[PDB]
Amino acid sequence: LVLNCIDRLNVYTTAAHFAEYAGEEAAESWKEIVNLLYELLASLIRGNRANCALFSTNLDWVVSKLDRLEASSGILEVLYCVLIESPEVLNIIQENHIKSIISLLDKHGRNHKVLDVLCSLCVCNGVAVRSNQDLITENLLPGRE
């Protein structure tokens, strides 16, 4: 139900666009509502392995929203909670996902939480993913920028 609410509220690019259909009095709380929705989703998914494993099917849903200017921190926290718990998501993570996260670093600046996410992508429960380590090395180090 929360996911459906987020998807339906995400179809508007900005508050003014939402105001063109719901009015200004309803638009002044659009950003607050979406931030609360992501905060509740994070509280609902923190620490539950079964719930984090539920995201092994729709990971692109979370990744494609990383570039949104609103609730950027909440969505990043949701991704961090999923990745720190579910090894299946690491087995489903692909190159386009890693390139998207690096572009997140490139566009939103030097944030240590993105670095912690990349660190978490490598090893989970004492087992390392060679493919992830190689893709990160190939797509992050040689640029030297």
């Binding site: 240590h112 990349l118 004492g126 087992v127 390392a128 380590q133 190689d134 180090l141």
Partner: protein, 688 residues
């Protein structure tokens, strides 16, 4: 800007520290290729400068120390640590020269960790980094760094830190005593485990730890330090306790070699004079283990009558037992490691309430080890084994391959690791020692590791699965003890030998079948639960079409003759041993089969269904018609093979003739049931 400005620019200090954490993450767990790539970014000169930089912030100093350990030492240290639990002692003259106490009932204790050790340990392999060589596969080796210079630098830095700590400077290096000592102690512990330090270096380390006890200034053991430093001191003392245990094992093996030689010479002389009555000749007509049990059964003075050993030899053995107890400190200012460790641990525990559970566990494990030394040796003897000097090169090669396999237990499976595993198995099977010394192989426990690898993969890697299955089949076929060892995991294999056998090669069901062949004891120890599980699998196989065949476009039939045949031959080996029928299992299997009649297939089904001859004729017509056969498996042949296997199994379940003559009611009942199931006329029709 100068990197020292990060002491005030905290945002960049944190970002760079997490960057170093990411470097360790990417090169973690044996990724030597990434370690080489990282060598282009963080070079040796920078690392060495960072080690001696006294103004560096604590987090950066710790990060660079851990980066150096991760890049250069982690893989070698881990492989050596894995190899440290075994004691393969060659019978060389250096081993012969080993004694419990130095020549200079009980004498003064020697220095721990100094002396001659003959236990086999594979050498480390390193490759020089280079980024201009033509780009070429064999696994890459770890980068090489000057170890003698690194160990000298570490010793000098630790000594300087010790002196500064004695001075109690108000500006400790790194901002805190923890940041001053923990990285250095981690580096020293890693180098100690890798065994780089020599005798003089170990003596210097022992002098800094305790200059008064380890004499042939003030120590670390009496200075107030935090829990992390206490933990590193516990790791060091654990290392030296392990070295003492290894020394005891090597001395015991040397004495065993000398005493066995004396025993053989004495027995040869006694037999020589005896050749010139059952009591006199019983010794030489008994198995050698019983012979040596009788020869060594003279410990008590109330049974020293039957022992023919001379009193001088008995005295020699009693003298060695006495000096073994003395070396273990069993009574017949601290001056020994055991008393030093006990005093330090008790003082620490009664001075403050320890909050670190890891530290608490470490100190109580060490205390238990000091108090119980004989039991530790007793539990370590099963992993000790003496080998001939001519098999050293093959044993070292086998240890290298086993180390590679063990290094493959902490990495996600891939095509390259699969190829490495396959070639390692081939190299192991190409070694004569693997067949000459089966007891040593069981003590090494390769089959447990292979089974654990197999369950971790569980089909994505059929070549790997069939390679593991062939290895275990060979292992069972070497000796009966291996077969008995594998029989304990029969249920473990069966629960994973479900649908998805693979249409490739040997399967866990095949290894399980190979683990019970020609063994009456294991056949009689075969549990009924395993047989009900197998019959339940066969029943499931007998009701649905084969999904792989359906995915390959074969015509649909409501059963799987191939899978049913595979379970049938397993029951054939389970019920027929050494040319005779085991009636307990035959009766159980037959009763289960009749309790589940749908296992017999569309034929013999009842309430509609033709006999065996009609089924065979239909199969023949299917074979003669290509459209009904294929879309390589031929359905007509599979069906005939299935019914042939079923009839073979029922025939082998038949009661014995001596039982029929004895008139056993159960035997007559079983034969009557089998006769009712299989008419004679159908048999003659098929034979015709």
């Amino acid at each position: 800007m100068d990197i020292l400005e990060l002491s005030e620019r905290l945002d960049l200090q944190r970002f760079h520290s997490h960057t170093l954490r990411l470097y360790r993450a990417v090169c973690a767990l044996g990724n030597n290729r990434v370690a080489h790539a990282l060598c282009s970014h963080v070079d040796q000169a920078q690392l060495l400068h960072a080690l001696e930089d006294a103004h560096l912030p604590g987090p950066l100093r710790a990060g660079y120390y851990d980066l150096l350990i991760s890049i250069h030492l982690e893989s070698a240290c881990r492989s050596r640590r894995s190899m440290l639990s075994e004691y393969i002692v060659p019978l060389t003259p250096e081993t012969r020269a080993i004694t419990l106490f130095p020549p200079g009932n009980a004498r003064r204790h020697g220095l721990p960790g100094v002396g001659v050790t003959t236990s086999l340990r594979p050498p480390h392999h390193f490759s020089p980094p280079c980024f201009v060589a033509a780009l070429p596969a064999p696994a890459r080796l770890s980068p090489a760094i000057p170890l003698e210079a690194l160990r000298d630098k570490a010793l000098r830095m630790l000594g300087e830190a010790v002196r500064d700590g004695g001075q109690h400077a108000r500006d400790p290096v790194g901002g805190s005593v923890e940041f001053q000592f923990v990285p250095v102690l981690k580096l020293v512990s890693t180098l100690l485990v890798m065994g780089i330090f020599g005798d003089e270096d170990v003596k210097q380390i022992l002098k800094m730890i305790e200059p008064e006890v380890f004499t042939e200034e003030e120590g670390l053991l009496q200075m107030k330090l935090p829990e992390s430093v206490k933990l590193q001191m516990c790791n060091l003392l654990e290392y030296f306790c392990d070295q003492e245990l290894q020394h005891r094992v090597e001395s015991l093996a040397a004495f065993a070699e000398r005493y066995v030689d004396k025993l053989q010479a004495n027995q040869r002389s006694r037999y020589a004079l005896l050749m010139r009555t059952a009591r006199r000749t019983r010794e030489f007509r008994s198995p050698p283990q019983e012979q040596i049990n009788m020869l060594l059964h003279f410990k008590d003075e109330a049974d020293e009558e039957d022992c023919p050993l001379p009193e001088d030899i008995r005295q020699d053995l009693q003298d060695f037992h006495q000096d073994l107890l003395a070396h273990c400190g069993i009574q017949l200012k601290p001056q020994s490691l055991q008393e030093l460790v006990s005093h330090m641990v008790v003082r620490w525990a009664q001075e403050d309430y320890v909050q670190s559970p890891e530290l608490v566990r470490a100190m109580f494990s060490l205390l238990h080890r000091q108090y119980d030394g004989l039991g530790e040796l007793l539990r370590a003897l099963p992993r000790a084994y003496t080998i001939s000097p001519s098999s050293v090169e093959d044993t070292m090669s086998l240890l290298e391959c086993l180390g590679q396999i063990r290094s493959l237990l902490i990495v996600q499976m891939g095509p390259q690791e699969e190829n490495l595993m396959i070639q390692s198995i081939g190299n192991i099977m190409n070694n004569k020692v693997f067949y000459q010394h089966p007891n040593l192989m069981r003590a090494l426990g390769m089959h447990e590791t292979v089974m654990e690898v197999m369950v971790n993969v569980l089909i994505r890697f059929p070549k790997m699965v069939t390679s593991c299955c062939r290895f275990l089949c060979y292992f069972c076929r070497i000796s009966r003890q291996n077969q008995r060892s594998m029989f304990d995991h029969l249920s473990y294999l069966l629960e994973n030998s479900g649908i998805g056998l693979g249409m490739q090669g040997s399967t866990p069901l095949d290894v399980a079948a190979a683990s019970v062949i020609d063994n009456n004891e294991l056949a009689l120890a075969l549990q009924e639960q395993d047989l009900e599980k197998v019959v339940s699998y066969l029943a499931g196989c007998g009701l649905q079409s084969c999904p792989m065949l359906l995915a390959k476009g074969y015509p649909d039939i409501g059963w799987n003759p191939c899978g049913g045949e595979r379970y049938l031959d397993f029951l054939r080996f389970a019920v027929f041993v050494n040319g005779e029928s085991v009636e307990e299992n035959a009766n159980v299997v037959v009763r289960l089969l009749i309790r589940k009649p749908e296992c017999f297939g569309p034929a013999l089904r009842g309430e509609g269904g033709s006999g065996l001859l009609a089924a065979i004729e239909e199969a023949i017509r299917i074979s003669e018609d290509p459209a009904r056969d294929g879309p390589r498996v031929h359905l007509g042949h599979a069906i005939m093979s299935f019914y042939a296997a079923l009839i073979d199994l029922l025939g082998r379940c038949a009661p014995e003739m001596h039982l029929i003559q004895a008139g056993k009611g159960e035997a007559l009942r079983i034969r009557a049931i089998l006769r009712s199931l299989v008419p004679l006329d159908d048999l003659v029709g098929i034979i015709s």
